[PDB]
Amino acid sequence: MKLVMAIIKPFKLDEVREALTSLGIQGLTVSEVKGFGRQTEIYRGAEYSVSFLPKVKVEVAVSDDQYEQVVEAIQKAANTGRIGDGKIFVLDIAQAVRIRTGETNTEAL
Amino acid sequence: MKLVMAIIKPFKLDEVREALTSLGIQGLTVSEVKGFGRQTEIYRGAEYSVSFLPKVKVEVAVSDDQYEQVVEAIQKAANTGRIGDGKIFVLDIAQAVRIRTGETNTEAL
Amino acid sequence: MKLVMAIIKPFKLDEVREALTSLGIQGLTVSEVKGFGRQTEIYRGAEYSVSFLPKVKVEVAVSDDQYEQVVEAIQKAANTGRIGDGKIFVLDIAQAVRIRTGETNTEAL
Ligand SMILES: Nc1ncnc2c1ncn2[C@@H]1O[C@H](COP(=O)(O)OP(=O)(O)O)[C@@H](O)[C@H]1O
Numbered sequence: 001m002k003l004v005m006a007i008i009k010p011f012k013l014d015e016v017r018e019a020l021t022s023l024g025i026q027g028l029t030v031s032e033v034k035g036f037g038r039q040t041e042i043y044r045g046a047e048y049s050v051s052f053l054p055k056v057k058v059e060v061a062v063s064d065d066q067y068e069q070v071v072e073a074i075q076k077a078a079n080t081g082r083i084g085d086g087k088i089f090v091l092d093i094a095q096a097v098r099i100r101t102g103e104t105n106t107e108a109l
Numbered sequence: 110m111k112l113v114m115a116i117i118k119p120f121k122l123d124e125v126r127e128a129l130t131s132l133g134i135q136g137l138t139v140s141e142v143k144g145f146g147r148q149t150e151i152y153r154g155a156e157y158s159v160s161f162l163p164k165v166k167v168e169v170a171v172s173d174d175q176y177e178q179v180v181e182a183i184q185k186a187a188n189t190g191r192i193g194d195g196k197i198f199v200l201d202i203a204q205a206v207r208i209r210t211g212e213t214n215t216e217a218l
Numbered sequence: 219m220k221l222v223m224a225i226i227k228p229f230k231l232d233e234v235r236e237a238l239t240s241l242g243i244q245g246l247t248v249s250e251v252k253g254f255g256r257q258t259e260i261y262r263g264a265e266y267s268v269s270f271l272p273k274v275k276v277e278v279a280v281s282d283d284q285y286e287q288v289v290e291a292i293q294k295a296a297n298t299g300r301i302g303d304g305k306i307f308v309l310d311i312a313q314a315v316r317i318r319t320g321e322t323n324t325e326a327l
């Protein structure tokens with residue numbers, strides 16, 4: 001099992017969701033985040049960040065047989081070719097549980 | 110060390126916290142998230158998500174000796190038996206640091 | 219590759235960003251979170267959390283050659299020596315992709 005974590009432009013969320021649904025992946029968790037990457041105001045000694053780049057973090061747990069296709073689908077849907085498109089990170093999941101049923105691992109996803 | 114990540118119904122957060130406290134686990138980090146799983150409006154070409162399912166993400170770093178009990182306690186407390194109860198994912202933590210002291214690994218948790 | 223996840227006091231975010239920039243790390247993702255660690259109101263049977271400790275979660279993907287220095291820089295910048303300074307967790311990243319280009323792994327970071 002893998003956790004696919006994507007940081008994308010907020011306006012690409014619906015396209016990414018659609019691409020994942022077409023793969024049979026409809027369960028995902030979305031977080032609002034602030035990005036720093038490629039305005040500040042100096043107040044009482046230090047530089048203070050006064051503007052931020054909004055991004056969306058998409059997290060989806062998927063099987064080892066699914067993860068490569070999921071990464072590909074997110075990359076293709078979230079791409080603009082312009083700066084700030086974001087990143088996809090894949091991490092290993094050791095164990096999973098479906099809270100409603102107690103089902104575990106692949107059967108929980 | 111393990112990172113236990115649970116996505117739960119917001120109204121179950123206090124019950125989950127209480128269950129973890131009873132185990133001697135009081136340190137945890139909570140994020141507000143949006144869930145997609147088991148309303149849209151069509152505007153200028155595409156389907157736009159106009160409603161979301163609020164969920165809470167609970168993240169707690171725990172020792173290898175603790176994680177199984179923690180997963181069990183969260184599952185039991187967050188369960189309703191109804192759709193949308195959520196998921197628990199366990200991931201491996203390679204290293205941990207307590208910022209205040211520089212303590213590492215188990216002694217940081 | 220490693221994902222360095224730090225939970226810090228919100229007023230330390232700019233100092234942490236500056237320390238990371240000095241290392242040549244400018245890409246990071248920040249989340250607003252609620253902390254529980256070291257007020258409640260009883261309503262209709264149960265204890266309800268009515269106050270929360272705001273924290274910031276900093277997530278930065280870095281190379282195996284960089285991660286130790288990154289952990290050190292965050293710890294030093296975020297430290298006050300007072301309760302609540304927070305935690306740093308390091309997790310393994312299996313794969314990474316830059317959405318704009320399709321670049322992978324170290325070249326994506
Ligand atoms: N190494 C990293 N770790 C964590 N988040 C990152 C990293 N690099 C980029 N990000 C996230 O991706 C966003 C885009 O990064 P940026 O360098 O601006 O564009 P690009 O990915 O096209 O080079 C950032 O705003 C940040 O949220």
Ligand SMILES: Nc1ncnc2c1ncn2[C@@H]1O[C@H](COP(=O)(O)OP(=O)(O)O)[C@@H](O)[C@H]1O
Pocket residue numbers: 027028029030059060061062098099100109116143144145146147162164191192193194195196
């Ligand atoms: N594979 C997954 N990856 C990430 N988050 C998920 C996944 N499946 C479910 N979730 C999260 O759990 C919530 C509940 O999922 P859902 O399928 O609606 O109910 P159930 O878990 O009872 O089948 C979703 O709203 C989403 O936040």
Ligand SMILES: Nc1ncnc2c1ncn2[C@@H]1O[C@H](COP(=O)(O)OP(=O)(O)O)[C@@H](O)[C@H]1O
Pocket residue numbers: 136137138139168169170171207208209218225252253254255256271273300301302303304305
């Ligand atoms: N085991 C843990 N897992 C996840 N988050 C934690 C853990 N311990 C602490 N935290 C986060 O770090 C914050 C500070 O923890 P606390 O125990 O209050 O102070 P200190 O880290 O100085 O002992 C908490 O509010 C919470 O957000």
